[PDB]
Amino acid sequence: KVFGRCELAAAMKRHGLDNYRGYSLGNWVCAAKFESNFNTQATNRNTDGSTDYGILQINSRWWCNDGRTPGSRNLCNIPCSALLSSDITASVNCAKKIVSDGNGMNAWVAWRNRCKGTDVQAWIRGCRL
Numbered sequence: 299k300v301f302g303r304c305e306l307a308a309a310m311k312r313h314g315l316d317n318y319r320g321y322s323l324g325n326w327v328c329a330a331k332f333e334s335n336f337n338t339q340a341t342n343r344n345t346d347g348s349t350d351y352g353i354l355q356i357n358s359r360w361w362c363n364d365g366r367t368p369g370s371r372n373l374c375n376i377p378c379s380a381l382l383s384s385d386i387t388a389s390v391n392c393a394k395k396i397v398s399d400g401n402g403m404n405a406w407v408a409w410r411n412r413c414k415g416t417d418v419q420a421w422i423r424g425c426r427l
């Protein structure tokens with residue numbers, strides 16, 4: 299599924315991400331836009347042989363199991379394919395664990411390079427929340 303901007307904002311808010319660990323909803327929408335263009339089916343391969351999955355591009359070296367990343371961890375205890383569903387619950391629940399792991403949202407490279415320090419509130423402008 300390819301989400302609309304306000305549709306995704308409302309879904310993330312319903313799942314408890316607004317101000318989770320101090321990160322306003324606009325941060326999460328901005329990260330999703332530049333990680334996946336709001337597409338739950340997005341995948342991308344990393345140089346080390348791991349793969350990033352879903353709307354928040356969660357990496358298989360650490361967070362999920364895809365059966366082809368030798369010597370990787372599965373810290374969210376889920377198949378990576380679960381992160382590609384039209385239902386974002388699995389991606390959101392894993393993201394909560396990632397952002398609590400010490401480095402905050404700096405775990406998302408596109409957030410650090412394209413959202414951090416910008417007016418992220420503009421990503422939820424006009425939405426009924």
Ligand SMILES: CC(=O)N[C@@H]1[C@@H](O)[C@H](O[C@@H]2O[C@H](CO)[C@@H](O[C@@H]3O[C@H](CO)[C@@H](O)[C@H](O)[C@H]3NC(C)=O)[C@H](O)[C@H]2NC(C)=O)[C@@H](CO)O[C@H]1O
Pocket residue numbers: 350354355356357358359360361396399400401405406
């Ligand atoms: C969205 C996504 O998948 N992002 C990936 C990043 O998570 C990943 O960065 C590495 O993440 C691990 C796990 O969070 C980091 O290890 C943690 O580091 C903190 C302090 O730095 C420490 O307190 C934790 O105990 C430790 N956890 C474990 C299990 O060891 C690791 O430092 C991150 N590395 C870097 C360079 O940021 C990166 C790199 O694999 O990929 C993203 O796609």
Ligand SMILES: [Cl-]
Pocket residue numbers: 322323324325418419422
């Ligand atoms: Cl915001």
Ligand SMILES: [Cl-]
Pocket residue numbers: 319320401402403
């Ligand atoms: Cl933080």
Ligand code: NA
Pocket residue numbers: 358359360361362363364367370371372
């Ligand atoms: Na893994």
